[PDB]
Design a protein around this ligand. Structure first.
Ligand SMILES: Cc1cc2nc3c(=O)[nH]c(=O)nc-3n(C[C@H](O)[C@H](O)[C@H](O)COP(=O)(O)OP(=O)(O)OC[C@H]3O[C@@H](n4cnc5c(N)ncnc54)[C@H](O)[C@@H]3O)c2cc1C
Ligand SMILES: O=c1[nH]c(=O)c2[nH]c(=O)[nH]c2[nH]1
Ligand code: FES
Ligand code: FES
Lengths: 1287, 49
């Protein structure tokens, strides 16, 4: 047959024309309208699309439940399953316990990741109603959150395992009998045989094979037929590498491919067995068998720990990993090292082979005949005297791709330490899984000793060569890991020989080496959140300073919260796809749309010619709407395809052929320096006498620092819907933007209509972080144009790869410093030259450099100082605002030379920082006076609560007692100036209505992006009006309610909009006063109705401007900032000197947020900002080709912090008794200032590296301090052999 | 009356907090809002006409 039949939230779906290219995510959202399930990446790395599948498993004979990525699940694989989405488990009328707890524990900020995380936790509970803490963490290996810093999610969910921010005693208990029935029809159908099915789409035919005979017959007659089991590789090939397999066969149903059989030599798994099943089977075997027999099983398990997450492992098959034959397979090295036995079949044939180097003859090839399939793999029992290790080092532990991965096996002659067999196999060192076949033969009959160690390392260094040009780079690191992994195996086998009672023959392990061989384990988290209770006397209805949950948290947990692309399509709505430059700098010689036009549903291709009025856009009017004559970066938008559906728009975009003639490209900061290519002139702040300071200085240190940029990775990408109204040029846009005003202005200028025709509406964003302050408009303008031209609504949401390529990021910085200082650590002179890479338009680049210069002091009084900045103009995507806006880059440079001062003086870093710190009343280098300077309080509190001094003693002891792991510890302060650097942007407006039922509709210029701005404004309005928050509502942000709004940026939006709201409320109260006087007790509703029937206006605007701002670079005078934020963080790390991996052991933060408007939201901002900083300085790296093409375009390669990344002990205190009388209700801004405090981790790492270097001098550590950079800096016997040589 | 356009309403539920937006051929936005809000039992502030 040919109908596809499945269930969704208990409702039967019958699809009569299933297309094999249709994903479950698209089917749920676009066909069924269930938009709780989100698109975050389309490549399995984010979990935002997580749903649960239930089925009756014929082989285990029972109902099973597992999680999947809907973005990679073909609907054609789902016949006779039952899907559950976030909508299926609960809603705001009756929240599931999972939904309730994540909301109430402040686990949801922007909300875009919340459904997927809910479904991960929900699936766990359906499988294990009483999970462990570890099981809970493990449920989320495949889920990302960019806002929360993960802490609150795990803390809320810990309640399921085994003053306060939330109260777990009010959480309703779980009743598992109340979960949805497994669809009774499906149980009835488990008693009918499966028949073969065929589904035909636009391009692809899918056969769901029911028997082995059908599969073999098919592959005999049609060897082209592409096997799909999990689709976790094929889905990537199709979506990202434009590969089309017109015939697909799915064999998942076939019993022989799903069998597990225990044999004498090992356990045989059907090739279609999911990795989840391999894991559960091997775990039971390992628990029950002798250790001597499970060495290989434990190797596989160790790799599967770090293999994707639960969603991928539920459907990814063991045979699929093998045949995919990726160079970076984590399993094939283990299978090759252990000689695992593979059975291959075709119609009428059967052969068995042992995986060895022959199995993989070439890039992504096996020795399978085209008509052959893999039936089974036998993973072997280990023998007496046979030992096994497996290793993986990546950029991040959880859900990442191996840089190097390995399986290692040794067999000893019985009763000896003499080698009978030795196998070292590697991924990530060639275009296939390889064996070190030259090195290992030579060690046969040798004893396991130092000479074998040295011989194998010399062999590996020669045998596993990498060309300077090898894909992925990091050749020194990768080579170093092969030797380092072998060292670990060498030491591990010594220990294993030990436990076999042969310690006399091979050494005992030196106890300072034992930590080298430990398998990773973190430890259960311990968290502390400290904040100040409001006064005893405060009304219970006054929520200012109380930890009120985000007003939309319940709806976010339930998937009812509406983001742009969740808005239903009009019946006549069209889809837009942007077409971008594949050259960094080139002339457009021609455009050929001939193939585009043949795609069904194609409407038109828009280019510069179609722009009605002006093609000049961007904040400084130096950008094109659409390229004209030349392209100036890879990612430069040339045009936009308009089609009926996003699929057809994508296909048509591929048929737009562009011909180019290259022009000289300027890529790097050095390129731009050499070509004098800059945005405007040098910016400079200077004070005192540099000549004099350097002459007075006992010591002078010079150096440079490079700081990599950063992708925002808002979980919701850029999105616009433009709705033309058909009259008078009127158009309404629904946009994920922090900047309604510029969106409106830019659309209006492009169309050539007045601003009064264009309305921009923002309900909420799934994150922004500065990325949607300006760069959102490159989508909005294109969609507006399409809508105008067609007279039809048009929509575009970027795919993650498009968004990462087009919209830019944080500015990379290169700095050259020279610092003068006394032997006491007192700094007397500093000169810093900053360079940033701005890319191909000015955008905010100059203002970012100004803030970096304003923060080049960090917390330190420096009497003689000079900083300069230059913004490089390059052929790269334009970089823009990212939370911190140049602050983090400025301050990291300051801390970097400060670290070298302390080292050079031989004084404790904390004493050097402390004695250079500003004091109350000092002037900054830009002559602003520091009043209400709480930094010393933050410092003293942090030093004391973190027990910094005693912890220094423990770090020193650890470092003396361990050779191959080291700890480091650092405490870092910060000062962060609050207000836009452009004075007039420090303004905000509100509009309030009171309706005659007493209910209040509030709006302001600020946009909700997960920071809890609307929540705070409601708290504010409720205090100002003296009514419960329940009577006040904010529905959205719009240009036609509050005009001329600044972007929601500069951490200032609650300050500005708070005042605006407060003033609007004061006007209403003034009007109600006479009614209050006449009816002093009679309720609010009676005053309102009395005012109304007296014809008194119940609508008011409110407005605020920050007073007394305006700095001059010419005179180094005037205040850029209204006040400053302050905080301190102390962090401890433990590095792996052999791999570059590290654990974040503990972080303690004390943050001055004034009198917090909402301590729950403010702690959440501290934690979220801190963890983005942690990413910036230690994990997140973008790579570009020499020709300026971004390689890094999804979560597979761009590694943001994961649940497993965060400090194990994570303590956050908000400073007590520090009212800030010049912001709303004595609060301070919080969004950006905490981010730089994650430098504490960077400097703790730097400390640990210094200890490692003393073990095996102002060494260079650039940002980010990734495993590559950490490992490479830990110079030893192994790095020496890999960088050039001398054996 | 024989208005050439008869009575007509489009009601668009927003799925959040009882929020609803109505496109109406009416001389009386206020009473439309009131009457909808009262029928549903939500505050006036959720209902836009
Ligand atoms: C987010 C993410 C993270 C990942 N992480 C990792 C990781 O850490 N390590 C790792 O090694 N991989 C990783 N992968 C790769 C992928 O998950 C594995 O390769 C998985 O095992 C592929 O299995 P599948 O059943 O989904 O294969 P499919 O995609 O269905 O098929 C893959 C290939 O195998 C073929 N095939 C399948 N079964 C057979 C058979 N019996 N005989 C012949 N050919 C067959 C198909 O024709 C196809 O060529 C990751 C993928 C994703 C999306
Ligand atoms: O001074 C600032 N101006 C901005 O426009 C902005 N944007 C941002 O994210 N931070 C800041 N800071
Ligand atoms: S959208 Fe499916 S994993 Fe990201
Ligand atoms: S709350 Fe998790 S991505 Fe925003």
């Amino acid at each position: 047959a040919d109908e596809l039949v499945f269930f969704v939230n208990g409702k039967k779906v019958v699809e009569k024309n299933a297309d094999p290219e249709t994903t479950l995510l698209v089917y749920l959202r676009r066909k069924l309208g269930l938009c709780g399930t989100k698109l975050g990446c389309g490549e399995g790395g984010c979990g935002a699309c997580t749903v649960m599948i239930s089925k009756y498993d014929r082989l285990q004979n029972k109902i099973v439940h597992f999680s999947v990525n809907a973005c990679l699940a073909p609907i054609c694989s789902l016949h006779h399953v039952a899907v559950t989405t976030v909508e299926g488990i609960g809603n705001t009328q009756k929240l599931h316990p999972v939904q309730e707890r994540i909301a109430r524990s402040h686990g949801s900020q922007c909300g875009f990741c919340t459904p997927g995380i809910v479904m991960s936790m929900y699936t766990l509970l359906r499988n294990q109603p009483e999970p462990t803490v570890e099981e809970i963490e493990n449920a989320f290996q495949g889920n990302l959150c960019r806002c929360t810093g993960y802490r609150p999610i795990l803390q809320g969910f810990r309640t399921f395992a085994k003053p306060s921010l939330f109260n777990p005693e009010d959480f309703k208990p779980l009743d598992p009998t109340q979960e949805p029935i497994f669809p009774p029809e499906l149980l009835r159908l488990k008693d009918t045989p499966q028949k073969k099915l065929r589904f035909e789409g636009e391009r692809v035919t899918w056969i769901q094979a029911s028997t082995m005979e059908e599969l073999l017959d098919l592959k005999a007659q049609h060897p082209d037929a592409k096997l799909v089991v999990g689709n976790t590789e094929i889905g990537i090939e199709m979506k990202f590498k434009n590969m089309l397999f017109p015939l697909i066969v799915c064999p998942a149903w076939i019993p022989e491919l799903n069998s597990v059989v225990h044999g004498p030599e090992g356990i045989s798994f059907g090739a279609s067995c999911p990795l989840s099943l391999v894991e559960s089977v091997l775990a039971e075997e390992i628990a029950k068998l002798p250790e001597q027999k499970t060495e290989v099983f434990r190797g596989v398990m160790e790799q599967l720990r770090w293999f994707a997450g639960k969603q991928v492992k539920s459907v990814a098959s063991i045979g699929g990993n093998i045949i995919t034959a990726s160079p970076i397979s984590d399993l094939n090295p283990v299978f090759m090292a252990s000689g695992a036995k593979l059975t291959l079949v075709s119609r009428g044939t059967r052969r068995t082979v042992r995986m060895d180097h022959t199995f993989f003859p070439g890039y992504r090839k096996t020795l399978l005949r085209p008509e052959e399939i893999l039936l089974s793999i036998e993973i072997p029992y280990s023998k007496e005297g046979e030992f096994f290790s497996a290793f993986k080092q990546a950029s991040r532990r959880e859900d990442d791709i191996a840089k190097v991965t390995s399986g290692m096996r040794v067999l000893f002659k019985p009763g000896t330490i003499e080698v009978q067999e030795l196998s070292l196999c590697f991924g990530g060192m060639a275009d296939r899984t390889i064996s070190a076949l030259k090195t290992t033969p030579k060690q046969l009959s040798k004893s396991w000793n130092e000479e074998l160690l040295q011989s194998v390392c010399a062999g590996l260094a020669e045998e596993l060569q990498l060309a300077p040009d090898a894909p992925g780079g990091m050749v020194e690191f990768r080579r170093t890991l092969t030797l380092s992994f072998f060292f670990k195996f060498y030491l591990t086998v010594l220990q294993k020989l030990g436990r076999a009672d042969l310690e006399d023959m091979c050494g005992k392990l030196d106890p300072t080496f034992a930590s080298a061989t430990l398998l990773f384990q973190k430890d259960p988290p311990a968290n502390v959140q400290l904040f100040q209770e409001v006064p005893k006397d405060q009304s219970e209805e006054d929520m200012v300073g109380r930890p009120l949950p985000h007003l939309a948290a319940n709806m976010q947990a339930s998937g009812e919260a509406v983001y742009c692309d969740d808005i239903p399509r009009y019946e006549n709505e069209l889809s837009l796809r942007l077409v971008t430059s594949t050259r960094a700098h080139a002339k457009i010689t021609s455009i050929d749309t001939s193939e585009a036009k043949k795609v069904p549903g194609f409407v038109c291709f828009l280019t510069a010619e179609d722009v009605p009025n002006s093609n000049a856009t961007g904040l400084f009017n130096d950008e094109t709407v659409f390229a004209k004559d030349e392209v100036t970066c890879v990612g430069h938008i040339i045009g936009a395809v308009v089609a009926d559906t996003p699929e057809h728009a994508q296909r048509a975009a591929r048929g737009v052929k562009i011909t180019y003639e290259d022009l000289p490209a300027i890529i790097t900061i050095q390129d731009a320096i050499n070509n004098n290519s800059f945005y405007g002139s040098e910016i400079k702040i200077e004070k005192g006498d540099l000549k004099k300071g350097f002459s007075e200085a006992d010591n002078v240190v010079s150096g440079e620092l490079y700081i990599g940029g950063q992708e925002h990775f808002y979980l919701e990408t850029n999105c616009t819907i433009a709705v033309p109204k058909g009259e008078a040029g009127e158009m309404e846009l629904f946009v994920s933007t922090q900047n309604t005003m510029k969106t409106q202005s830019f659309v209006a200028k492009m169309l050539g209509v007045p601003d009064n025709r264009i309305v921009v509406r923002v309900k909420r964003m799934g994150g922004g972080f500065g990325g949607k302050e300006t760069r959102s408009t490159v989508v909005s303008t294109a969609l507006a144009l399409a809508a105008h031209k067609t007279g039809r609504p048009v929509r575009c949401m970027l795919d993650r790869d498009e968004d990462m390529l087009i919209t830019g990021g944080r500015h990379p910085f290169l700095a050259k410093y020279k610092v003068g200082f006394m032997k006491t650590g007192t700094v007397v002179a500093l000169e810093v030259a900053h360079f940033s890479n701005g890319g191909n338009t000015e955008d905010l680049s100059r203002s970012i450099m100004e803030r970096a210069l304003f923060h080049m002091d960090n917390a330190y009084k420096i009497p003689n100082i000079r900083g300069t900045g230059r913004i490089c103009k390059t052929n790269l995507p334009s970089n823009t605002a990212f939370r911190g806006f140049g602050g983090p880059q400025g301050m990291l440079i300051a801390e970097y030379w400060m670290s070298e001062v302390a080292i050079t003086c031989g004084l404790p870093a904390e004493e050097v920082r402390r004695k250079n710190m500003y004091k109350e009343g000092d002037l900054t280098h830009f002559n602003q006076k520091l009043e209400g300077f709480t930094l010393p309080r933050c410092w003293d509190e942090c030093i004391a609560s973190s027990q910094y001094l005693a912890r220094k003693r423990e770090v020193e002891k650890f470092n003396r007692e361990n050779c191959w792991k080291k700890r480091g510890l650092c405490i870092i302060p910060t000062k962060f100036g609050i207000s836009f650097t452009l004075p007039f942007l420090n303004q905000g407006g509100a509009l309030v209505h009171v309706y005659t039922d007493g209910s209040v509709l509030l709006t302001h210029g600020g946009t909700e992006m997960g920071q809890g701005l609307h929540t705070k404004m409601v708290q504010v309005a409720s205090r100002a009006l003296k009514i419960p928050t329940s009577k006040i509502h904010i529905s959205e942000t719009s240009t036609n309610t509050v005009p001329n709004t600044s972007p929601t940026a500069a951490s200032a939006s609650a300050d500005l909009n708070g005042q605006g709201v407060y003033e609007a409320c004061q006007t209403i109260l003034k009007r109600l006063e006479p009614f209050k006087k006449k009816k002093p007790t009679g309720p609010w509703e009676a005053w309102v109705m009395d005012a109304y029937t007296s014809a008194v206006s119940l609508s008011a605007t409110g407005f605020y401007k920050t007073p007394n701002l305006g700095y001059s670079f010419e005179t180094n005078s005037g205040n850029p900032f209204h006040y400053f934020s302050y905080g301190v963080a102390c962090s401890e790390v433990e590095i792996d000197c052999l791999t570059g991996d590290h654990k974040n052991l503990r972080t303690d933060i004390v943050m001055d947020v004034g009198s917090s408007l909402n301590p729950a939201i403010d702690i959440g901002q501290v934690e979220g900002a801190f963890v983005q900083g942690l990413g910036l300085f230690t994990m997140e790296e973008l790579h570009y080709s020499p020709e300026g093409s971004l390689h890094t375009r999804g979560p597979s390669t761009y590694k943001i912090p994961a649940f497993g990344s965060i400090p194990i002990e994570f303590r956050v205190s908000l400073l007590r008794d520090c009212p800030n009388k010049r912001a709303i209700y004595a609060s301070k801004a919080v969004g950006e200032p905490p981010l730089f405090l994650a430098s504490s981790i960077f400097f703790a790492i730097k400390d640990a590296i210094r200890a490692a270097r003393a073990q095996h001098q102002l060494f260079q550590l650039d940002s980010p301090a990734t495993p590559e950079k950490i490992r490479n800096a830990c110079v030893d016997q192994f790095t020496t052999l890999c960088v050039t040589g001398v054996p």
